[PDB]
DNA sequence: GGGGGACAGCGCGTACGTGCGTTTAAGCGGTGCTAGAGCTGTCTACGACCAATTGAGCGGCCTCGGCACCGGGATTCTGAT
DNA sequence: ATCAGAATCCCGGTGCCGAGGCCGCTCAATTGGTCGTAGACAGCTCTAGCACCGCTTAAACGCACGTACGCGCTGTCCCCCGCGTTT
């Protein structure tokens, strides 16, 4: 199922007003979903590459944070 | 039947918290985030020291290499104060032998 | 206007995941289905992906907000997002 | 018999850091004062981070340090935000900040 | 008779088209070398320099300034203007994250 | 001596024309010189630190490449 | 007798890459097929770079590769622009690009 | 009295150049730029392979580690082209072994 | 010297903020099971190390020809008409 | 639409200095041999990922309505710009 519509426009509205926006256009949501799809098409692909390299098929959180720090987004949290 | 022994610094994190804040507690995910920060800073300084040792064609890392790595990686006075106290952290390391 | 800025001030203090975790998990599984078939995901991996994606898009949203403020406007535009991705280097 | 951590005046394990540096494949030979200096630097950074977290914890009357305190204490400092620029904190967020044009008139 | 004067902006686009197909250093070499020595005098005195170091510094600074001017022009075009402004420069810097 | 006047107005004008700028304001030059000073006082300071580690008082181009690749500005040129 | 470069048919060296991997403090144990893989990857990347540079040189009626040809070759290719994003090329410049609103009005 | 024996790829890149474009020359500045490019991408792939060996807690780098490093660092169809040419290079090297 | 461009003011209207009924499925939580991550044993093929050998990689010289440079013809926008 | 007028592209004459070919050294790749050792593979276990489903309700969809800001237009006033002269 196509779950890109699962990111509803009230959720994108709450996320945008979290960042400090008071007026959000209606066309913001489509490009926001596209950028989220690009980010989850890169990072999860890198995690799939790590999990395939590890002779596994369960995606761990350490592969996720490895993909995040590979692209320059260092994350402190799950995995260690 | 334990699985494996962990490799973290949570007891040392709690001890450092006890020297700084004797009355303030810590949570588990805060210690996980702090341990991730410790590991990232350790990897950054170790990689910078390894690169700087490879630049001068030296296979041995001394205290001067990691002093220069701390100077390069850390801006502001946070390196420079670490220039001083870490040096005397060397000195009473050498005075205790 | 007033209630929007009031919940903005509330939401600069709050920290919960605004994206519901089940549709985001379904989207993650849907995207990962294209790369490798029959994949499993740890829950901490999904939570880390959710937190990092939310932080990245919040940074993109505040970049969009400052771009729209610079354009003598207050309503954001998709071209602000395009300019932010172009200057940020995230646009291929 | 006697640990190298207390002989160096520190508390972090110098032997663990030296063992991690030895098999971490950074150099053929590892010196003695370099892991001591590394332990001193990370101990000072840990002390600064934890004391700013204690500042943020006593700002909101909390006797337990949460990562909200870490998020509010890693971004208010200009030097720590300069060092940790692209660093993402789990269960974090943004500082409370509103632009001047967004204020009501 | 009146002298032949081109329109304001046509000459500017003419040297944009000339300088987008050029591989020369717009900054003069010896004032840039004096500036590099003056900057390095703040950190450590009696420092010697290779000419290749000065040329590499000049090329990197010129490329960084060209990219900064490109982002500034993008910000000025986004602000419905053809003239760049200092606010465009600080906007491109804070999007790039170069302001600490 | 001060070499802020060494970066002349036609030099910044040519750098803006190479960047594709149709019209240049008069206050562009001061902030452009300031950003140049910031970038130079980062890169040259890192090069001085690299030279000071190498027990030398001569700043070579290889340390300049080291300082440029430390900040993420990869350069293929003099030094190697 | 026979070198490993001619054994795998690759122009790029294998013994030099293997020595650099062994003495580069990368790993304790270094494989045998990995320097061959690295030499093949370097040879193909070099061949693609010089092929695009030769296309740019024959576009400009030149038989010698100037760095302007490298600038027109790397930045025009989207894979080389994406991978070598922060790479500054010495003695180069920018692609010929003028914005639509900066064009003169007709 | 020679100074030192340097390390460069002046012969190999020229050999590939004459393999592809026999009528095209190259300058020494472009030779230095190309050598710096080759050395930098080699350093990137070596660092990725070392980090991936430490990722699996392994002291040995095999062909699969550099396969994964090429698949990760290179985007587009050049990654799978390099994977195919590396697999055929490994089989033709082991067949000639 | 000036003229186009940044900036300020004012009306259009529409597009998004706000409120509420309604639907939509998100969230919490017991249950099983089972594929698979991880741990343990073995032994083995692959790699580090020592030493003699060599042939290709690199320093030095050269001579030449590809491109640097000049002017005059032709082209091509370009302002005034 | 239509005019000449400067900026620039191109072609021929020529010249000149880095670039590749050659000479010759020399040092790291090559190969033979040996011993260490990390992991390939197979059983064994135990664990959480996934699927499921019922109850409660948080929240999204969407319609109605409103009003305030993008935006088109107009006026203004001045800021660099093209060009001439001097350092």
Curated annotation (Swiss-Prot), chains A, F:
Keywords linked to the UniProt accession: Acetylation, Chromosome, DNA-binding, Methylation, Nucleosome core, Nucleus, Phosphoprotein
Q: Where in the cell is it found?
A: Nucleus; Chromosome
What are the recorded GO MF terms, alphabetically? DNA binding; protein heterodimerization activity; structural constituent of chromatin
Which top-rank group of organisms is this from? Eukaryota
Q: What positions are modified (N6-succinyllysine)? A: 9, 55, 57, 69
Which GO terms are recorded in the biological process aspect for this UniProt protein? nucleosome assembly
A GO CC term attached to the entry: nucleosome
Chain positions with Phosphothreonine modification: 58, 60
Query: What does the annotation say about its assembly with partners?
Result: The nucleosome is a histone octamer containing two molecules each of H2A, H2B, H3 and H4 assembled in one H3-H4 heterotetramer and two H2A-H2B heterodimers. The octamer wraps approximately 147 bp of DNA. Interacts with Nasp; the interaction is probably indirect, mediated by histone H3.
Family classification: Belongs to the histone H4 family.
Q: What does this protein do?
A: Core component of nucleosome. Nucleosomes wrap and compact DNA into chromatin, limiting DNA accessibility to the cellular machineries which require DNA as a template. Histones thereby play a central role in transcription regulation, DNA repair, DNA replication and chromosomal stability. DNA accessibility is regulated via a complex set of post-translational modifications of histones, also called histone code, and nucleosome remodeling.
Entry protein name: Histone H4
Organism of this sequence: Drosophila melanogaster
From-to range in the entire protein, with total length = 24 to 103 of 103
UniProtKB/Swiss-Prot annotation, chains B, H:
Question: Does this UniProt record's set of keywords contain Cytoplasm?
Answer: no
Modified positions (N6-succinyllysine) are: 18, 88, 92
Keyword match Hydrolase: no
How is this chain modified after translation? Phosphorylated by the catalytic component of the Dbf4-dependent kinase (DDK) complex Cdc7. Monoubiquitination of Lys-92 by Bre1 gives a specific tag for epigenetic transcriptional activation and is also prerequisite for histone H3 'Lys-4' and 'Lys-79' methylation. Deubiquitination of Lys-92 by the SAGA complex is involved in activating transcription of a large subset of genes.
Q: Which residues cross the membrane?
A: none
Q: What does this protein do?
A: Core component of nucleosome. Nucleosomes wrap and compact DNA into chromatin, limiting DNA accessibility to the cellular machineries which require DNA as a template. Histones thereby play a central role in transcription regulation, DNA repair, DNA replication and chromosomal stability. DNA accessibility is regulated via a complex set of post-translational modifications of histones, also called histone code, and nucleosome remodeling.
Fragment boundaries within the full protein? 27 to 123 of 123
Q: Which GO terms describe its biological process?
A: chromatin organization
Q: Which GO terms describe its cellular component?
A: nucleosome; nucleus
The name on file for this protein is Histone H2B
Which species is this UniProt entry from? Drosophila melanogaster
User: Which gene holds the coding sequence for this protein?
Assistant: His2B
Swiss-Prot record, chain D:
Q: Name one GO cellular component term.
A: nucleosome
Q: How is it modified after translation?
A: Deubiquitinated by the polycomb repressive deubiquitinase (PR-DUB) complex.
Which processes are annotated in GO (biological process)?
chromatin organization; heterochromatin formation; larval somatic muscle development; nucleosome assembly
GO molecular function of the protein, one example? DNA binding
Modified residue annotations for N5-methylglutamine? 91
Which residues are recorded with the post-translational modification N6-succinyllysine? 23
Q: What does this protein do?
A: Core component of nucleosome. Nucleosomes wrap and compact DNA into chromatin, limiting DNA accessibility to the cellular machineries which require DNA as a template. Histones thereby play a central role in transcription regulation, DNA repair, DNA replication and chromosomal stability. DNA accessibility is regulated via a complex set of post-translational modifications of histones, also called histone code, and nucleosome remodeling.
Subunit structure of this entry? The nucleosome is a histone octamer containing two molecules each of H2A, H2B, H3 and H4 assembled in one H3-H4 heterotetramer and two H2A-H2B heterodimers. The octamer wraps approximately 147 bp of DNA.
Q: By what name is this protein known?
A: Histone H2A
Species the sequence originates in: Drosophila melanogaster
Q: Which gene encodes it?
A: His2A
UniProtKB/Swiss-Prot annotation, chain E:
Give the keywords, sorted. Answer: Acetylation, Chromosome, DNA-binding, Methylation, Nucleosome core, Nucleus, Phosphoprotein
- One GO CC term, this protein: nucleosome
Sequence positions bearing N6,N6-dimethyllysine: 1-2, 44
In what way is this protein post-translationally modified? Phosphorylated by the catalytic component of the Dbf4-dependent kinase (DDK) complex Cdc7. Acetylation is generally linked to gene activation.
Location in the cell: Nucleus; Chromosome
List modified residues, type N6-methyllysine.
Answer: 1-2, 44
List N6-succinyllysine occurrences by residue.
21, 44
Keyword Nucleus: yes or no? Answer: yes
Q: Look up keyword DNA-binding and say if it applies.
A: yes
Give the GO molecular function terms.
nucleosomal DNA binding; protein heterodimerization activity; structural constituent of chromatin
Question: Which GO BP terms sit in this record?
Answer: nucleosome assembly
Family note: Belongs to the histone H3 family.
Functionally, this protein is described as follows: Core component of nucleosome. Nucleosomes wrap and compact DNA into chromatin, limiting DNA accessibility to the cellular machineries which require DNA as a template. Histones thereby play a central role in transcription regulation, DNA repair, DNA replication and chromosomal stability. DNA accessibility is regulated via a complex set of post-translational modifications of histones, also called histone code, and nucleosome remodeling.
Oligomeric form and interacting partners: The nucleosome is a histone octamer containing two molecules each of H2A, H2B, H3 and H4 assembled in one H3-H4 heterotetramer and two H2A-H2B heterodimers. The octamer wraps approximately 147 bp of DNA. Interacts with Nasp.
Q: What is this protein called?
A: Histone H3
Organism source for this protein?
Drosophila melanogaster
User: Span within the entire protein?
Assistant: 37 to 136 of 136
């Amino acid at each position: 199922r196509d779950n890109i519509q699962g990111i509803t426009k009230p959720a994108i509205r709450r996320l945008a007003r979290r960042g400090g926006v008071k007026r959000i256009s209606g066309l913001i949501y489509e490009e926001t979903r596209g950028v989220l799809k690009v980010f989850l098409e890169n990072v999860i692909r890198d995690a799939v590459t790590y999990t395939e390299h590890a002779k596994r098929k369960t995606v761990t959180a350490m592969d996720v944070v490895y993909a995040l720090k590979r692209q320059g987004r260092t994350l402190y949290g799950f995995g260690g | 039947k334990k699985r494996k022994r962990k490799e973290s610094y949570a007891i040392y994190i709690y001890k450092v918290l006890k020297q700084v804040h004797p009355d303030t507690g810590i949570s588990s995910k805060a210690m996980s985030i702090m341990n991730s920060f410790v590991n990232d800073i350790f990897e950054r300084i170790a990689a910078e020291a390894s690169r700087l040792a490879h630049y001068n064609k030296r296979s041995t890392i001394t205290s001067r290499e990691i002093q220069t790595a701390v100077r390069l990686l850390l801006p502001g006075e946070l390196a420079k104060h670490a220039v001083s106290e870490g040096t005397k952290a060397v000195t009473k390391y050498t005075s205790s032998k | 206007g007033t209630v929007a800025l009031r919940e903005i001030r509330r939401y600069q203090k709050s920290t919960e995941l605004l994206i519901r975790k089940l549709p985001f998990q379904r989207l993650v599984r849907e995207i990962a289905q294209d790369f490798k078939t029959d994949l499993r995901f740890q829950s901490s991996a999904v939570m880390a992906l959710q937190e990092a994606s939310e932080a990245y898009l919040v940074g993109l949203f505040e970049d969009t907000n400052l771009c729209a403020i610079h354009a003598k406007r207050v309503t954001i535009m998709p071209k602000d997002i395009q300019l932010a991705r172009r200057i940020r280097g995230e646009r291929a | 018999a006697k640990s190298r951590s207390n002989r160096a005046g520190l508390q972090f394990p110098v032997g663990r850091i030296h063992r991690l540096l030895r098999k971490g494949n950074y150099a053929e030979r590892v010196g003695a004062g370099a892991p001591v200096y590394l332990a001193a630097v990370m101990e000072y950074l840990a002390a600064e981070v934890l004391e700013l977290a204690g500042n943020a914890a006593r700002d909101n009357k909390k006797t337990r340090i949460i990562p909200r305190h870490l998020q509010l204490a890693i971004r208010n400092d200009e030097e720590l935000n300069k060092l940790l620029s692209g660093v993402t904190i789990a269960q974090g967020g943004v500082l409370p900040n509103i632009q001047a044009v967004l204020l009501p008139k």
